Amino acid sequence: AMVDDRPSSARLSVRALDTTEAGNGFWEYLPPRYGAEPAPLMVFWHGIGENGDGSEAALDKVLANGPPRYIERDEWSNERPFVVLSPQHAGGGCPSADEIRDFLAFAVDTYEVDESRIYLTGLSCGAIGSWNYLRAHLDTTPIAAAVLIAGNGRPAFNDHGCDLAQVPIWGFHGDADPTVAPAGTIEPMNGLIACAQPRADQQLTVYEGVGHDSWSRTYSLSAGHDIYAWLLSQSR
Ligand SMILES: [Cl-]
Ligand SMILES: [Cl-]
Ligand SMILES: [Cl-]
């Protein structure tokens, strides 16, 4: 097949709140081969600093960190096969479990995606929300794996224990984080890793001496943890 090979920003589109069926404004990134075969899906949730009302103007905030930052800057490899959606959370705190559920339902209904390869990822509030999403919806979640950075999964693991270990998770945290305590990732990932086989893959990365921003070095691969290859190795 012949394939679009323009840099990633060429396929980045703003989808403001109330221009789609979604309950969030979001950034839409389509991979080069979108449409040719069902694509893996990645839904990324931003941190609290980037909250906004989902309008086009407000959505610019979401470009600050994570996948949409690299996509907008043409620093997101064309080899990456994901549809990447980056919704904006409105209001004052972290996205809720049901907000994340509803947006994942929208995404799967709307895009030509491989439903066996739905990936959830977030940083800070976006990770906190994703953990809470798993706590609420573990028994029905369609996701294949999650990469959760600088969040708090203690309630989710306290609730479910090794039942949660059926979802593959890679948790990341800086151990000097003064904003979200690193026990938030370390305790649940240690618990999940200790869970007996058969269980999903579980990984924990602790950046020693690193503060709250443990996401830049993760999503950019400057720290050498290939979260994209790991996600793609997971499926339902
Ligand atoms: Cl910058
Ligand atoms: Cl609020
Ligand atoms: Cl590093």
Side-chain angles (χ1 to χ4, degrees):
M2 71 186 80
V3 181
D4 175 15
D5 196 41
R6 294 173 302 167
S8 54
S9 60
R11 298 173 300 276
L12 176 66
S13 304
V14 74
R15 302 286 180 217
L17 183 60
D18 299 324
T19 70
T20 76
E21 290 316 300
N24 304 77
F26 64 100
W27 289 96
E28 169 202 282
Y29 172 71
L30 304 175
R33 296 171 219 263
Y34 183 72
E37 293 177 350
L41 166 67
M42 179 189 300
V43 178
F44 159 75
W45 297 87
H46 65 77
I48 203 167
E50 288 66 58
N51 286 5
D53 64 16
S55 68
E56 276 191 32
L59 272 158
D60 271 345
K61 289 181 198 162
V62 176
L63 303 178
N65 305 127
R69 173 194 176 86
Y70 303 109
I71 290 157
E72 199 269 339
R73 292 178 188 241
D74 297 331
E75 299 171 356
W76 183 268
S77 173
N78 283 352
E79 302 314 296
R80 293 174 186 169
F82 318 94
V83 170
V84 185
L85 307 182
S86 301
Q88 182 163 52
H89 173 66
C94 304
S96 71
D98 287 354
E99 176 181 0
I100 295 176
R101 176 206 54 202
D102 293 346
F103 189 81
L104 284 171
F106 160 85
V108 171
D109 185 39
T110 302
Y111 290 94
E112 298 185 20
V113 295
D114 177 3
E115 291 180 22
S116 71
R117 287 183 297 154
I118 302 161
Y119 308 123
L120 177 64
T121 185
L123 63 94
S124 197
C125 252
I128 287 165
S130 288
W131 278 113
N132 279 331
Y133 160 78
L134 289 173
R135 181 186 182 188
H137 298 299
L138 176 64
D139 305 326
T140 60
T141 183
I143 74 166
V147 168
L148 303 179
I149 301 156
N152 180 1
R154 301 178 79 177
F157 185 70
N158 181 249
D159 193 328
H160 290 294
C162 290
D163 293 350
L164 181 57
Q166 291 301 123
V167 178
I169 306 174
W170 192 345
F172 289 79
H173 220 117
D175 71 6
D177 193 330
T179 290
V180 178
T185 301
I186 292 167
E187 176 182 279
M189 293 313 317
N190 283 341
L192 292 168
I193 285 164
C195 288
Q197 294 290 347
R199 64 146 166 81
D201 298 339
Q202 304 295 342
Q203 284 201 79
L204 166 67
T205 291
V206 176
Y207 296 121
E208 296 204 0
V210 168
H212 187 40
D213 179 358
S214 43
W215 50 84
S216 299
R217 71 190 68 204
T218 300
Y219 288 117
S220 69
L221 307 189
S222 65
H225 297 281
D226 190 347
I227 54 168
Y228 308 116
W230 182 81
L231 283 174
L232 287 164
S233 77
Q234 312 298 330
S235 67
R236 294 294 291 267

